[PDB]
UniProtKB/Swiss-Prot annotation:
Disulfide bonds: none annotated. Monomer. Interacts with UBE2L3/UBCH7; UBE2L3/UBCH7 is the most efficient ubiquitin-conjugating enzyme E2 for the ubiquitin ligase activity. Interacts with UBE2N/UBC13; promoting 'Lys-63'-linked ubiquitination of target proteins. Composed of an N-terminal stalk, a dynein-like core comprised of two catalytically active and four inactive ATPase domains, and a C-terminal E3 module. The ATPase regions do not generate movement but rather act like an intricate molecular 'switch'. The RING-type zinc finger domain is required for the ubiquitin-protein ligase activity. The lineage of its organism: Eukaryota, Metazoa, Chordata, Craniata, Vertebrata. ATP binds at A10, D12, R73, K337, S412. Atypical E3 ubiquitin ligase that can catalyze ubiquitination of both proteins and lipids, and which is involved in various processes, such as lipid metabolism, angiogenesis and cell-autonomous immunity. Acts as a key immune sensor by catalyzing ubiquitination of the lipid A moiety of bacterial lipopolysaccharide (LPS) via its RZ-type zinc-finger: restricts the proliferation of cytosolic bacteria, such as Salmonella, by generating the bacterial ubiquitin coat through the ubiquitination of LPS. This is E3 ubiquitin-protein ligase RNF213. The gene is Rnf213. It is found in: Cytoplasm, Cytosol; Lipid droplet. Belongs to the AAA ATPase family. Disruption phenotype: No visible phenotype. Males and female are fertile and produce normal-sized litters. Mice do not spontaneously develop Moyamoya disease, a chronic occlusive cerebrovascular disease. Mice are however more susceptible to Rift Valley fever virus infection. Mice show elevated expression of MMP9.
């Protein structure tokens, strides 16, 4: 649109005449100039508005400098869905019968623009179109939703704090951000407190049952039941799940941006089982996408997913989900593009009344450090094909040097990706503790040493992050692979220590003739095998992990001699 307004139609005649554009444009027409929206809107007709001026309105309220037609379509579709929920609620009639809820609808549209800023506004030289992430989940995500079945709403992701001029402003939790001055009138605030709206709630100090009730209301689930409670449900995860649900229930394609460390599959499975509750039908459908996947199997799997989608919907009245993990490593990433962006599989249209939501993932596009590139090229014999002559690149850089071998994400997906988070390590250690308490089975193993195990796991993870390069971003993937290693080492830690003492007695002096913990030595083995085995700067790791170790192995020499002794034992 930005490059047609000057020289000149532009809008689709059948789409302007559609409600998905007429309703947002009608509301924007009434709101651009200042009129009370108490009048009855959405006549189920076509207003005397022009497609050109409609495009002008959506441009001046889209904010981003150079929007494609896809981004305008996303904005308008999202805004239409949200205003449809607003009209479906009895709050317009609530204001009519209250006669003092004035200023409610201007706040409604302003907050709509805010959450649209959230949703339909994203944004090395060749990685610049991809790695340049202006907004992360470490940003304000003000969210409001209208719960269909009942008459209670949910205001998540922000706070309402009394302003100095008598008003109430949007203050984000855990810090001070004073965005959106003068958004509402105090009569709306009074009517809201008359309506007992759950506004300005810090969800970090609310019970699991109550937060699940808040979700089920927000997720529109009636008679909620709690399917899983072994996963911590923080505020940011709530923001993510509501973001996904809004995205795929309004119509926006939902591509997921994040690294392997972040928990994405777990969260979507959580959402799917919350939607399902107790039916035995297969709702979530994981698809493992990898660097040998060709379009035939993706097309076939999507077809079978839509088949099982009819199966679920027609005779269960349920909504299912199909998921793709790291759906970027395939040379057929664009196949995922036509699957999800324009709703067409292998040239065949995907039915909106079938009942199915497609969610795909993506890896972050970032080049390795030159230090580990030297490490790789020096791994004995160098690579067969050098970088200048590698055919499978994305730009001027081979996939061999990237942190994930990921091909160029096609356009019309860049305006769609949105990051889940970097796993800031504030909740990393808690998840590690949960894993090490769930899968170690330490009912009677070590009442307090489990804290030490989790802490040294987090310390090693921080060592991995506190270094310019990493193997493959094995964050929260090597820990859930090494808890099992630790459990195995403890399970056989009985004859191992006996053989250790025998070997050290029959082949060494009295220095290695001391008792060792069945756990701490097992911890030394787990760190030696999962983490200390791979990296080539082992001295630094030995000196930077000896801190979290207790008295027997306070230094690097102790850890090294223990690992070497066990290798010699085997
Ligand atoms: N002039 C227009 N007026 C209204 N909507 C438009 C206009 N042009 C495009 N759109 C909207 O843009 C959306 C995306 O466009 P479309 O799928 O044709 O993109 P594309 O350029 O073919 O995609 P890609 O290059 O990613 O394959 C369509 O669903 C359509 O509704």
């Amino acid at each position: 649109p930005k490059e047609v307004i000057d020289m000149e139609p532009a809008m689709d005649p059948v789409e302007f005449c559609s409600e998905a554009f007429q309703r947002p444009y009608q509301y924007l027409k009434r709101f651009h100039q200042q009129q009370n929206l108490d009048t009855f809107q959405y006549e189920k007709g076509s207003v005397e508005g022009s497609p050109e001026e409609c495009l002008q309105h959506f441009l001046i309220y889209c904010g981003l400098i150079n929007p494609s037609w896809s981004e305008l379509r996303n904005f308008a579709w999202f805004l239409n869905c949200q205003l449809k929920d607003c009209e479906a609620s009895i709050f317009c009639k609530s204001a009519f019968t209250g006669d003092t809820l004035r200023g409610f609808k201007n706040f409604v549209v302003t907050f709509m623009i805010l959450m649209a800023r959230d949703f339909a506004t994203p944004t090395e030289e060749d990685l610049a179109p991809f790695s340049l992430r202006k907004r992360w989940e470490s940003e304000p995500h003000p969210y409001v939703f209208f719960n269909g079945d009942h008459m209670t709403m949910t205001f998540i992701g922000f706070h309402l704090e009394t302003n100095n001029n008598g008003y109430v402003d949007a203050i984000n939790p855990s810090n001070g951000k004073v965005i959106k001055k003068d958004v509402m009138t105090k009569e709306l605030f009074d009517g809201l407190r008359l309506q007992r709206v759950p506004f300005n709630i810090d969800f970090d100090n609310l019970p699991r049952y109550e937060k699940l009730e808040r979700l089920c209301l927000a997720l529109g689930i009636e008679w909620p039941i709690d399917p899983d409670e072994t996963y911590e449900l923080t505020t940011d995860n709530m923001l993510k799940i509501l973001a996904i649900e809004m995205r795929f229930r309004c119509g926006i394609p939902v591509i997921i941006m994040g690294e392997t460390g972040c928990g994405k599959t777990r969260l979507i499975k959580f959402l799917s089982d919350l939607k399902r509750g107790s039916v035995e039908a297969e709702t979530m459908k994981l698809v493992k996408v990898h660097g040998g996947t060709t379009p035939s199997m993706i097309y076939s799997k999507v077809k079978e997913a839509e088949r099982t989608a009819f199966s679920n919907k027609a005779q269960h009245k349920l909504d299912t989900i199909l998921f793709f993990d790291q759906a970027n490593t395939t040379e057929a990433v664009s196949c995922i593009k036509e699957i999800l962006c324009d709703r067409t599989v292998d040239g065949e249209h995907l039915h909106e009344d079938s009942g199915l939501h497609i969610i795909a993932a993506c890896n972050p596009y970032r080049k390795h450090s030159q230090e580990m590139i030297l490490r790789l090229e020096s791994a004995g014999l160098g690579y067969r094909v050098s970088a200048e002559e590698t055919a499978d690149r994305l730009g001027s850089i081979p996939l061999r040097q990237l942190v994930y071998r990921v091909h160029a994400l096609p356009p019309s997906l860049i305006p769609l990706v949105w990051d889940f988070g970097q796993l800031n390590d504030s909740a990393e250690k808690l998840y590690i503790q949960q894993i090490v308490q769930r899968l170690v089975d330490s009912v009677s193993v070590n009442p307090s040493e489990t804290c030490v195990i989790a802490d040294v796991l987090s310390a090693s993870q921080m060592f991995m992050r506190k270094r310019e390069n990493e193997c493959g971003f094995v964050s929260l993937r090597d820990v859930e692979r090494c808890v099992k290693v630790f459990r195995w080492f403890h399970d056989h830690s009985d004859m191992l220590l006996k053989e250790l003492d025998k070997f050290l007695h029959e082949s060494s002096d009295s220095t290695h003739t001391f008792e060792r913990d069945p756990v701490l030595w097992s911890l030394v083995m787990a760190i030696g095998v999962c983490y200390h085995a791979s990296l080539e700067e082992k001295a630094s790791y030995r000196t930077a992990i000896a801190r979290c170790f207790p008295k027997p192995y306070n230094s690097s020499r102790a850890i090294l001699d223990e690992v070497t002794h066990v290798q010699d034992l085997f």
